[PDB]
Design a protein around this nucleic acid. Structure first.
Lengths: 205, 80, 80, 85
RNA sequence: UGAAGAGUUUGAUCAUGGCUCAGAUUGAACGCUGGCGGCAGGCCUAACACAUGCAAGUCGAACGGUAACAGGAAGAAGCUUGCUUCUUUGCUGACGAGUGGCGGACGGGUGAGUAAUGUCUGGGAAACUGCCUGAUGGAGGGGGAUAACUACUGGAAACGGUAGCUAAUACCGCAUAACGUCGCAAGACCAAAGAGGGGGACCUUCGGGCCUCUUGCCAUCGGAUGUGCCCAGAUGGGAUUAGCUAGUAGGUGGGGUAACGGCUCACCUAGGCGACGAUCCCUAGCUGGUCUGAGAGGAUGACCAGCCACACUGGAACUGAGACACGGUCCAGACUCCUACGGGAGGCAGCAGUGGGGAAUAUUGCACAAUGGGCGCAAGCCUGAUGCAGCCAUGCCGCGUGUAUGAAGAAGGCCUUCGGGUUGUAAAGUACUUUCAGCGGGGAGGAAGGGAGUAAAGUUAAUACCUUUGCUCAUUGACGUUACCCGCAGAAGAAGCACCGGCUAACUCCGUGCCAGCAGCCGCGGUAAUACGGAGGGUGCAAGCGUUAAUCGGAAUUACUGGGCGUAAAGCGCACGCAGGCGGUUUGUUAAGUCAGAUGUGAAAUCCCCGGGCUCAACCUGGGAACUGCAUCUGAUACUGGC
């Protein structure tokens, strides 16, 4: 099933941008002119502690577009290998193929990157992959499939990705549409403006 | 008789085999005397994808135990 | 080594047998409390130097009759 | 009557009468040694045993009594025949 | 492989005390609703009951034969005069039926019974077994049977009988032989079968000699696995179930049996059992496990493995290596079906389907193509085993219902003294890409193993079987319109459910009006319940979501981890005391308990911890860990126990 909820209203709702309809413009942005509170802010109640957890839980899941039970599987996989449930949980979401295609710059939104996985337009190790939940292996090569390597919207996403900083744990060539995934996401370059002291209170119990 | 045979595992489409010493009486998947290793018909990317103690096979031949043709092909799969 | 027990005669009313009581004298596995736990055996003896109240030493051996497998060795306290 | 098993039933019922007649045949020879023990007569029970061993050895040759009963038929009475012989 | 919190006694507060919620498992069931695939599960109920069909067959390399198909021949002919359908001949291959041996105790199924000396953990000593494996030995002769078949016959039928013919690896006498046994020895008993594939050289009434291989028969005892006998430890509770038994307790003897033993008959002595719960009843298969908890623990032992008991009631014996023989045999009881009235027959707790039952569980399915088991040395045959599809969200896991852009923000709605808000960048417009699907095209892997040729001083006696690292070829598909890819438009065909005042995240507005309708507590509602119905927006989850049932996690409220008895559950009114428990010090001793060292046992699967395999996960699988203990060995020697 798909959420199908709003793209930018949720970014404003928690006061924190989701890289939804906002990743490539600064002018002519269509972002509802950065909506001033009007008579709404004066009528907003305080959230409960049970609700503050849920606001975090939904935010951290929806920024990557992932399923609940898979996000919970990563909460069980972050508990092992001295990984910290508050630290490796983020790197498990960031390490999915549907986000590796995004960080290689092939799509200007996560949904435009997940499009390439879901339409079988991506390959890993030279093999076609349709699984968005795939955990990419270290020192493995990700590339755009032969039948998709001429897309001008991907050349145009790369025209913009050449102007961005890359993750330290991967590389990509804008000509070949190809990159080595060097390492699993690392706390030496991975950071997020999320409540890392609060995500530990989840699934307990 | 006491025989050296492949026990059927791996479930559907990609079977996996445990090489055992067992009695041929009654139940197909009956109790088994001893295991000597494992055999994989599928590529595993490892040079220990199949493992056998050929000296322990020679010790069970030293008990007079029977051999099955599929296990003679397994002894060939470890290049004897 | 063979199994041997010390116990006491609780009935001598039959000629070639003695009823012998043996104990466990050990802690209970979930309470730590000592439990004596007495069990009776119908022990063979055709010597008749012992009787009721005598402390006796018995050994485990082959069945001789229905439910009977233990036999007399010696009198331990020798009170008479 | 559903697995067409009928021939094994007649081969078993034929073997019933036959195996019982194998036992009857050798029991008649044993009966005649315990009758010679009643006869109180000069080596008569030893002579009754000299004709019995070849009837119990044959009845043991395919099965029937060969586990221990034949080795009883050739030893359980061998001190009693020795008396009045 | 590791540790909770929150709602709740009131006018307050603090104890003491019970109640409650977020969570989860399931052969679930019901309703709203339902896109793809794989993997698993799928009559627990009525131990009530069946019409129909299937499910277990097979070997001619044991063989009297020939119901058929090839090939030859003969012939009735057929005619087309050179061959053949015939349809007979058993010759060769081969093979329906029978003889003969094996399989059926495999394959499976039920969980009624059983708190069990059954089951689970671990030990004891005394026996029995086919294939297998080891050791030491044997291979002569005769008498005739007996299906089938042939001619007769009892009967309504099931189901057989009379008389004769016929073979063997089917039967029975005589013989022969220890490893076996009797006779202190001379001596003697008791066995049986071969079958088929190949032949160099040499000889031959060219029949056989001679060579040889694979696989069989008999002799009497070991080994493995299996089976039987004994025992210690472990298993649910209740006494408002208290008395039990006297074939019972101990013993001896006969009889039987594989060993042992009350297994069984007869007799002698006079007990035995219960307090640590016998007797009685209820519930229940047990275990590895399944699920759950940080753990102690709790619930539960389907499906899958390791054992058991059972298959309409009860008793019984026989057959085989193995059967207290589920589809074998006998007999009565019940139930039924058939009857020609004379009698007979039968077992859905194997796979389907049906009747009855029930909340409820599939096709009166496809193939034998791979795998095991069966017959067969191998070819070949059989297989609702096994492989699979059909039907069923019943569970697990991944995955589809596109991506981007598009306005003071349109048409349509909902909130709104009407400022604006919200649906909503949603739509329309445009760009842009097609996964899955549909249809057409191409089409893997599961088809190896065996077989043919080639090669090998294979072993043997170099081209019988069989073996061989290889090479070369004809071959085998239920699933299946497979997987995977290509091609073609075209975003095209693909979404619900419950809830939104507190615990409790989402927010209002309308209707209902103490009536209806909700609820776990709160209590709501007597016409502003955002608490009952609906609408707009929203929350959460999603091919599911809600509801019910059972049982767990919250639970430190059964108590060691980790409580109470003055006043908030309760110290017995008091003393005495049997049975049971505890008990100062010093020097030895034995080494049970104890501690140490070490080995065996602790199945697979499953879990945990760490990895690997198809694009992931489901699924599958390597490693590490534990199974606290139990059994046994060799030491230590303080303290307890024994002395």
């Amino acid at each position: 099933a798909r959420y199908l909820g709003p793209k930018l209203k949720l970014s404003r709702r928690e006061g924190t941008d989701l890289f939804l309809k906002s990743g490539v413009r600064a002018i002519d942005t269509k972002c509802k002119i950065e909506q001033a509170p009007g008579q709404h802010g004066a009528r907003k109640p305080r959230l409960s502690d049970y609700g503050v957890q849920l606001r975090e839980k939904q935010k951290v899941r929806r920024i990557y577009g992932v399923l609940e039970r898979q996000f919970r599987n990563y909460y069980k996989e972050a508990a092992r290998l001295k990984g910290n449930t508050g630290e490796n949980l983020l790197a498990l979401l960031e390490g999915r193929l549907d986000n590796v295609v995004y960080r290689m710059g092939f799509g200007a939104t996560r949904a435009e990157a997940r499009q390439l996985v879901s339409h079988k337009a991506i390959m890993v190790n030279g093999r076609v992959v349709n699984i968005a939940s795939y955990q990419v292996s270290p020192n493995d090569v990700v590339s755009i499939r032969e039948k998709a390597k001429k897309q001008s919207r991907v050349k145009a996403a790369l025209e913009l990705a050449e102007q961005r900083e890359k993750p330290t744990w991967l590389e990509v060539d804008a000509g070949k549409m190809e990159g080595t995934f060097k390492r699993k996401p690392e706390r030496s370059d991975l950071s997020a403006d999320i409540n890392e002291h609060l995500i530990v209170e989840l699934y307990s119990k | 008789m006491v025989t050296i045979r492949l026990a059927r595992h791996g479930a559907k489409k990609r079977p996996f085999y445990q090489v055992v010493v067992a009695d041929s009486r009654n139940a197909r998947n009956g109790r088994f005397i001893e295991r000597v290793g494992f055999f994989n018909p599928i590529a595993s990317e490892k040079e220990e994808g199949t493992r056998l103690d050929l000296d322990r096979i020679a010790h069970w031949v030293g008990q007079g135990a029977t051999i099955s043709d599929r296990v003679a092909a397994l002894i060939k799969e470890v290049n004897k | 080594k063979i199994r041997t027990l010390q116990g006491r005669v609780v009935s001598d009313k039959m000629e070639k047998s003695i009823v012998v009581a043996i104990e466990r004298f050990v802690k209970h596995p979930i309470y730590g409390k000592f439990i004596k736990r007495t069990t009776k055996l119908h022990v063979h003896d055709e010597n008749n130097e012992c009787g009721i109240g005598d402390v006796v030493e018995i050994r485990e051996c082959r069945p001789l009759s229905k439910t009977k497998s233990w036999t007399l060795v010696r009198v331990v306290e020798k009170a008479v | 009557n559903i697995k067409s098993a009928k021939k094994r039933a007649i081969q078993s019922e034929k073997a019933r009468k036959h195996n019982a007649s194998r036992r009857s045949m050798m029991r008649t020879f044993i009966k005649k040694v315990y009758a010679a023990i009643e006869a109180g007569d000069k080596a008569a029970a030893q002579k009754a045993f000299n004709e019995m061993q070849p009837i119990v050895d044959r009845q043991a040759a395919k099965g029937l009594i060969h586990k221990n009963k034949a080795a009883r038929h050739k030893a359980n009475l061998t001190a009693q025949i020795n008396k009045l012989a």
